[PDB]
Amino acid sequence: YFQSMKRVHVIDSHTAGEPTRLVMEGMPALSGRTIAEKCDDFRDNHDAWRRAIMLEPRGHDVLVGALYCAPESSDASCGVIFFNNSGYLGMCGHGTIGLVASLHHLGQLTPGCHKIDTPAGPVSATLHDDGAVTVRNVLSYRHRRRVPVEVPGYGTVHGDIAWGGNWFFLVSDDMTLELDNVEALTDYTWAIRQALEAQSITGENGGVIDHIELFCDDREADSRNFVLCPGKAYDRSPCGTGTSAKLACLAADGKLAPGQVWTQASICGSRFEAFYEREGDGIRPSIKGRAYLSADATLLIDERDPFAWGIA
Amino acid sequence: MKRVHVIDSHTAGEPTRLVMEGMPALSGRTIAEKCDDFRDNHDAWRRAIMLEPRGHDVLVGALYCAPESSDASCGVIFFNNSGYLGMCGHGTIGLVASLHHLGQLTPGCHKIDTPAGPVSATLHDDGAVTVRNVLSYRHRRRVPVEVPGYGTVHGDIAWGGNWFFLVSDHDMTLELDNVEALTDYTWAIRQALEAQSITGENGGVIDHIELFCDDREADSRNFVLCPGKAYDRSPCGTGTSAKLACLAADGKLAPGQVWTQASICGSRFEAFYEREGDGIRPSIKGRAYLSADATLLIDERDPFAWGI
Numbered sequence: 001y002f003q004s005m006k007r008v009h010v011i012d013s014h015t016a017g018e019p020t021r022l023v024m025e026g027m028p029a030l031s032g033r034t035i036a037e038k039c040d041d042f043r044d045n046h047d048a049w050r051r052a053i054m055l056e057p058r059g060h061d062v063l064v065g066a067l068y069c070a071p072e073s074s075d076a077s078c079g080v081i082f083f084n085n086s087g088y089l090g091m092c093g094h095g096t097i098g099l100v101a102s103l104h105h106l107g108q109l110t111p112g113c114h115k116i117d118t119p120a121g122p123v124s125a126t127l128h129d130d131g132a133v134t135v136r137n138v139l140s141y142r143h144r145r146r147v148p149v150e151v152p153g154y155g156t157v158h159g160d161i162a163w164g165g166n167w168f169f170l171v172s173d174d175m176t177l178e179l180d181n182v183e184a185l186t187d188y189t190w191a192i193r194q195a196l197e198a199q200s201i202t203g204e205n206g207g208v209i210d211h212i213e214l215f216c217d218d219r220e221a222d223s224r225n226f227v228l229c230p231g232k233a234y235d236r237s238p239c240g241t242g243t244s245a246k247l248a249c250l251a252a253d254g255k256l257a258p259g260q261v262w263t264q265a266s267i268c269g270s271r272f273e274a275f276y277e278r279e280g281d282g283i284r285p286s287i288k289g290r291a292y293l294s295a296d297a298t299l300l301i302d303e304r305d306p307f308a309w310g311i312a
Numbered sequence: 313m314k315r316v317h318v319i320d321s322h323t324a325g326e327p328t329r330l331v332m333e334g335m336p337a338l339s340g341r342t343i344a345e346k347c348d349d350f351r352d353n354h355d356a357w358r359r360a361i362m363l364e365p366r367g368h369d370v371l372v373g374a375l376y377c378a379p380e381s382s383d384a385s386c387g388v389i390f391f392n393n394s395g396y397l398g399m400c401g402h403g404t405i406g407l408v409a410s411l412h413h414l415g416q417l418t419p420g421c422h423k424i425d426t427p428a429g430p431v432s433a434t435l436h437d438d439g440a441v442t443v444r445n446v447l448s449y450r451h452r453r454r455v456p457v458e459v460p461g462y463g464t465v466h467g468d469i470a471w472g473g474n475w476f477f478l479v480s481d482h483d484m485t486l487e488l489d490n491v492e493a494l495t496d497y498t499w500a501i502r503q504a505l506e507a508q509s510i511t512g513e514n515g516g517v518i519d520h521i522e523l524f525c526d527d528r529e530a531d532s533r534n535f536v537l538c539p540g541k542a543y544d545r546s547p548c549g550t551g552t553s554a555k556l557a558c559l560a561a562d563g564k565l566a567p568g569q570v571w572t573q574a575s576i577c578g579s580r581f582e583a584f585y586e587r588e589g590d591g592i593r594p595s596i597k598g599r600a601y602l603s604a605d606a607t608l609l610i611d612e613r614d615p616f617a618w619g620i
């Protein structure tokens with residue numbers, strides 16, 4: 001068949017348009033008592049494998065990979081290591097929805113509430129009767145409100161600096177957010193990101209603000225957004241962490257009450273439903289979204305191929 | 313869920329998705345007729361396979377078909393995220409290599425039926441594939457074009473299966489880490505030509521731009537802007553055919569003399585030509601390698617089932 005090649009079984013899915021590659025069998029065996037030590041093992045001793053499935057030509061820039069792992073915790077359903085074409089992640093909301101929907105379609109997870117171990121600790125994910133998944137996000141908060149930043153080529157932009165599991169600069173209403181305009185939106189948000197760094201504008205404790213999000217009105221959602229992610233990429237989904245940061249700002253401005261659902265549309269019209277409860281002076285947001293399968297695949301690595309382990 | 317069996321491969325870095333079973337049956341007796349049927353009655357399947365999130369913008373699709381002609385090994389319909397192609401050199405290499413790996417083609421010269429006529433491809437005993445390109449020729453030599461923000465650029469206008477502007481020179485450094493600047497420059501050139509109505513013969517839009525530089529191992533390295541502000545990961549079989557045509561016209565390369573072209577990612581094709589009219593018949597040799605054996609899955613509940 002392809003007996004001279006290395007075979008890796010993956011299940012590709014997308015969460016509201018943002019793709020996840022779940023890796024099931026064939027990947028190097030990892031050692032460690034916890035998911036974090038396994039992630040170190042992957043990084044230190046098996047990184048070529050991350051590169052083979054995430055770099056071109058097998059991977060493409062927007063993909064997140066998710067390696068299925070045995071559970072660490074006694075009450076966890078499984079463990080997972082997330083990664084991309086540049087390195088290893090901690091938590092990954094859209095990837096977790098992908099993981100859960102994937103394992104759902106394989107019968108390994110059934111409706112109800114599941115704990116999932118990650119290198120950054122446990123994540124609670126509820127699989128609903130209808131196949132949707134709600135993931136409870138980390139504590140989220142706003143650091144600063146309506147901070148002006150002069151962006152060469154665009155003048156002065158105001159935005160909130162907030163934390164939702166990543167640092168965001170949120171600019172909420174006159175670019176408008178259509179999918180056919182992503183080049184211009186990327187240029188703009190990129191200019192903002194560069195200006196923040198040039199001008200030493202950070203999150204709490206020096207945190208680099210590496211995500212930029214724009215919000216506008218939407219006919220059938222509370223808002224539509226465009227989200228610049230690290231590496232000049234945009235999120236196809238409404239962005240779980242970005243939407244968590246948005247809710248923190250809404251809460252801090254008294255525009256959204258605990259328990260109240262906010263519906264966030266993405267640049268491509270997919271949607272997340274979100275709500276929060278108060279935790280101290282911050283919020284605990286939950287993000288509900290839906291993933292669908294893309295492929296059940298055997299990745300093939302042919303050692304004769306000059307790009308077997310990925311193009312730089 | 314709809315299930316579609318694909319073999320993904322790449323040819324010098326440029327990926328091909330070979331569709332094998334699972335698609336609706338296409339009506340027609342010629343590959344041309346089956347392509348029209350695909351386009352008119354089953355286009356959503358092209359989009360499901362090629363648009364995000366299942367496909368990506370550098371991918372070419374190839375639907376395996378029964379051969380129409382007695383001496384052809386098979387038929388193929390090539391397509392991408394915008395529509396349907398006729399011939400596709402790099403996809404033909406991936407097709408042939410894939411069939412070889414499936415045990416369906418053995419080394420030798422093969423004829424493959426496409427909507428734009430037959431393509432001759434030789435599968436060599438070492439697994440390489442030579443594809444014979446359409447007749448290629450230079451239309452104009454050293455045409456000057458004034459590019460807003462970059463100055464005056466010269467290049468040949470040549471046909472290789474697509475219309476190309478081949479840039480005479482530039483101080484751009486053709487390295488993979490510089491694709492953003494190279495795209496900006498070549499896109500500006502492309503827009504400049506179209507604004508000044510600088511075209512191929514018959515008003516043909518020059519939608520590909522090629523830059524060349526020296527290489528330590530190959531005769532040349534290029535960067536190729538393709539439609540969609542995308543770049544070719546391979547040396548570009550049609551752009552290399554166009555280049556040979558220019559070399560041949562300049563008497564810089566003789567019939568049968570091999571030229572080796574490196575790509576922006578350091579992958580390589582070998583090329584040579586024989587004369588045919590006042591143009592050339594080039595052949596392009598490269599290699600394809602497998603990426604995945606996959607079942608694409610289309611869930612009708614998915615708002616993006618048939619692509620974003």
Ligand code: NA
Nearest residue numbers: 218219221222
């Ligand atoms: Na609204």
